Chains A and B, each alone.
Chain A
Amino acid sequence: IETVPVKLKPGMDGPKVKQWPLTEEKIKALVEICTEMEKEGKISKIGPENPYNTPVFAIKTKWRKLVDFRELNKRTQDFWEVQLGIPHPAGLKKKKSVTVLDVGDAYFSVPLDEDFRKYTAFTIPSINNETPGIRYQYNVLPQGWKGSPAIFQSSMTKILEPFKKQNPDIVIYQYMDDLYVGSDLEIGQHRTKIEELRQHLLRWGLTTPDYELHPDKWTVQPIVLPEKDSWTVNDIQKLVGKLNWASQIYPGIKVRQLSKLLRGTKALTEVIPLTEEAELELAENREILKEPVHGVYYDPSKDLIAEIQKQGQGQWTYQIYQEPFKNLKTGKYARMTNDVKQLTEAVQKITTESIVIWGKTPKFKLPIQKETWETWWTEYWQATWIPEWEFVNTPPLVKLWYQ
């Protein structure tokens, strides 16, 4: 088959990234996987004249390879995002159910431009440096790579055309390695269609590993001020603080009346009666806070940002946004667990949501020390993709005031 030529963005060199060290169970898993892959010509071992490197992991009963093509993608996908891009349906966010299929296997049937392949180099590392790492590079379309779905996009339309005609009301979107299938039918009916699709795909050669999302049920986390019968001076001071903050997210907030209550030098525990003006000023602000924030648009040109705060009791709040106070979405996960297992489950929940809504992953700011996260994220992780992340290590002293 012919190879679609691929050129990095110009004035850019291929990825050169340190391979984090692995446990011996993952390494064994990886040499098993990559050995099979090589017999099947997917990859092949490589010289030392190839200096490039992209990291590799093992995530899971059987093991799965995972490659971090985040640098390569930042150096290639951006060109293919223009030249060879993939449109995102505004309707998928509205479907009742969205199932997510893995169609990574598809990519192993298109070959990659021989001139590109050196840039897909990875290194299965070795314990205690007993040996040089095993080095390979890809000859077919790699699973992590934002190029791979883009090139296969043509072939992928030809396979789904029959189904998309017998079923014109189901939405299908392709985000690197995964197929988002949204329908508006009973879970049981939707569950079949998907099974009917899986069979379609297999008829035409796409294996699909043998969950269910409900986006219409999705809703933001509104700002909620306390609703108490008697207010201590502290109770009022805090309420003043929270509003004073909301003023950024929400024009129309007022604290004159309520701050009047705090006229003097009182003790924190003293109970204060609420003046009618404040009870109204308070009553007006509550309505505004209930009002869905209005006037924030998604600007494709810009990166999304996701912040996550750890509340207690297994709960985590988040906000996604492009500019500081102009929030595209906010949410709260409560868990049914290691903090870190919780935090990776969040990151994955948020990324999925963000793929479905905007066809974009955000860049997380994770409240966890870097090395702890680098040491343990792959332990809980089940996604085929990996978002960008930085680490906040300065406490969000801001009172949670996010519920």
Chain B
Amino acid sequence: ISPIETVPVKLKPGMDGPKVKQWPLTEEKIKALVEICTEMEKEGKISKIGPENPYNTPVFAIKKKDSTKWRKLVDFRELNKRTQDFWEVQLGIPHPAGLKKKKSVTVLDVGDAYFSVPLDEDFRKYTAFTIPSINNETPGIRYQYNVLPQGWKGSPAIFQSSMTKILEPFAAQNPDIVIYQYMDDLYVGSDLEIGQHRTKIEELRQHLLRWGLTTPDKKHQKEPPFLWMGYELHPDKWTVQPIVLDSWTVNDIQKLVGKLNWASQIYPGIKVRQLSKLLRGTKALTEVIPLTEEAELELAENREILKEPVHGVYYDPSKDLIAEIQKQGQGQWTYQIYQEPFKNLKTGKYARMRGAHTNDVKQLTEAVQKITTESIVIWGKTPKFKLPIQKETWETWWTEYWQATWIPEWEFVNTPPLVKLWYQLEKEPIVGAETFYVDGAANRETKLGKAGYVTNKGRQKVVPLTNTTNQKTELQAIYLALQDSGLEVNIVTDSQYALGIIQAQPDKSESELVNQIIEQLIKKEKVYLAWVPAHKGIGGNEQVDKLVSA
């Protein structure tokens, strides 16, 4: 229908067209498929063909809802499997928070979008279909498309591409208007007078029509309820569309978690830590699951948050973005982004990425990272941060931290809980502090071994252990030397493993053993840990290795 140029399309390199058999169909449907195709034929959308074309893909008819009018559905699965790859249509949807507030906004959907755009001539042959014959006697009637088939791999991208072409000139002639594109929809917004906006919107309709694209006129949707891709878009604010939810299957769990995650855009401090732990093993969507008092309390808190309706603002270039982060529980964080002091653009959560021996400063730095990136996508700049960590605490951390790390303009926010370093090892051996020489060892068959230490004042100890790995013993030894120590200890291991864990100053871990070490390292006044190579004839080491290896 459009005088628009066509996009050259080609089948995959070593593949050829489809040749599927058309199945028989209730004769009532055959009549409908005939009327629909005849009308399409009349509009140039499809053209009849002869037996020369050897390609076929199947056709079908669905009741068309309760309309009881029938609709044509071709199945293009084979063809798509043989149609070349395209430059994919963008998967990301615009986040309402990045929509710049504009006085007037119009939504213009495009009618029979795909069918309004030509198809590469040389590709049409493959878009061939057969209307089944009434009786098995009479060959069926045959067709091919001259416009973008609806099931086809390529219709979206080609539709998109042709619309972009048709907008470039207009959008240039009129910089005062901001046109956005998502699937068949064109969202136009302006800061002109209502009359000037409508005049340009009509001029736009006018333009699109000259290219064979129709649009509503004063059947355009009404602003108040712009229900869009899961959101309510009101001219003054946006929210999430209302979210419902007591059921305890597995699939019920994932749907719930997803709904909660969707609500976390804007509803502060929705929680899903516990409930996501109940997704262990999974697979069986029907499998029932026990409602922990920790997770079923979670869901209690959540319903209360969902009783209050929350809205977010649109975005204002003139103003700064601010982002402020709160520590919420363990390994759970939460963040708001806003421009005015209580009018949020959006919120969200960040949860502790998979990994053992984590630490709150490291996590904070990580969370700043996800927010920074998020910001660039939605707004195209980074926010100013408001973080609950003193610059004493941060500057100490980054100066000693082995990686490069960076956090942009930020300001302390004295709101507990504050991010702190729970301990700090000494840089230099401590004078007048018992020097514990530790080691551990285990037997890879018996899953058994020993932990122990030997000190300068002659102190010694060994305990036996069961179901242990060599590392777990290397680390257990450290634990002993701590437990049997003063406020000031020097410890000497050969374990690169154990050294590493502790030197990275973990603030928590799933390894209870580490947590004991950590909780010990806090109570201590001073600790210096030091490393020596193994089996190299070093003193305490050689003695301690004999103690617990044989």
Contacts and interface: CB of A to CB of B under 8 A. Distances in A.
A27 B180 contact: no
Nearest to B504: A395
Interface stretch (B267-275, B441-449, B535-543): B535-543
A338 B407 CA distance: 9
Contact of A21 (B377, B403, B528): B377
Contacts of A265: 435, 437, 454-456, 458, 539-540, 543
A132 B180 contact: no
A185 B538 CA distance: 56
Given A22-B376, A264-B539, A312-B399, A397 B496 contact: yes
Contact of B98 (A23, A48, A128, A369): A128
A133 B98 CA distance: 17
With a 10 A CB-CB cut-off, give which of A130, A312, A338 has the most chain B CB atoms. Answer: A130
A264 B537 CA distance: 10
B329 interface: no
14 contacts: A24-B380, A49-B7, A51-B88, A123-B87, A234-B530, A241-B532, A267-B456, A310-B404, A367-B402, A368-B403, A369-B403, A372-B369, A372-B404, A375-B372
A372 B406 contact: yes
B503 A48 contact: no
Interface in B505-538: 528, 530-533, 536-538
Nearest to B457: A267
A282 to B, nearest CB: 16
Interface of A: 21-25, 27, 47-51, 53, 121, 123, 127-133, 135, 232, 234, 237-238, 240-241, 244, 255-256, 259-260, 262-269, 309-310, 312, 338-340, 342-343, 367-369, 371-372, 375-376, 393-397, 399
Interface in B452-475: 454-456, 458
B161 interface: yes
B536 A129 contact: no
A135 B538 contact: no
Given A127-B379, A264-B539, A397 B86 contact: no
A377 to B, nearest CB: 11
A399 B536 CA distance: 18
Given A240-B538, A310-B403, A232 B7 contact: no
Interface string B1-40: 0000001111000000000000000000000000000000
Contacts, number: 186
Given A266-B435, A266-B539, A367 B7 contact: no
Contact of A48 (B86, B377, B399, B404): B86
Nearest to A398: B496
Contacts of B85: 51
A48 B373 CA distance: 27
A23 B381 contact: yes
Contacts of B370: 371
B160 interface: yes
A237 B377 contact: no
B93 interface: yes
Contacts of A268: 429-430, 435, 490, 492, 528, 530
Interface string B371-393: 01100111111100000000000
A298 to B, nearest CB: 29
A21 B378 CA distance: 10
B8 A49 contact: yes
B321 to A, nearest CB: 12
B402 A396 contact: yes
A395 B86 CA distance: 42
Contacts of B458: 265
A130 B539 contact: no
A64 B34 CA distance: 59
Given A135-B87, A266-B456, A23 B376 contact: yes
Closest 4 CB pairs between A and B?
Answer: A24-B380, A339-B404, A128-B98, A268-B429
Contacts of A262: 537-539
A368 B404 contact: yes
A338 B405 CA distance: 8
A393 B365 CA distance: 14
Interface in B417-444: 429-435, 437
B499 A397 contact: yes
A132 B89 contact: yes
Interface in B71-112: 84-90, 92-95, 98-99
A310 to B, nearest CB: 6
Contacts of B157: 48
A237 B403 contact: no
B529 to A, nearest CB: 11
A121 B85 CA distance: 15
Nearest to B377: A21
With a 10 A CB-CB cut-off, give which of B99, B157, B456 has the most chain A CB atoms. Answer: B456
B366 interface: yes
Given A48-B87, A49-B9, A266-B456, 14 more contacts: A47-B161, A48-B7, A50-B87, A51-B84, A128-B95, A128-B377, A130-B98, A132-B164, A237-B532, A240-B533, A255-B537, A368-B404, A375-B373, A375-B376
A201 B484 CA distance: 77
B430 A269 contact: yes
B158 A48 contact: yes
Interface in B150-192: 154, 157-158, 160-161, 164, 178, 180-182
B402 A128 contact: no
Interface in B261-294: none
B248 interface: no
A24 to B, nearest CB: 3
B412 interface: no
Contacts of B531: 241, 399
Interface in B186-218: none
B180 A131 contact: yes
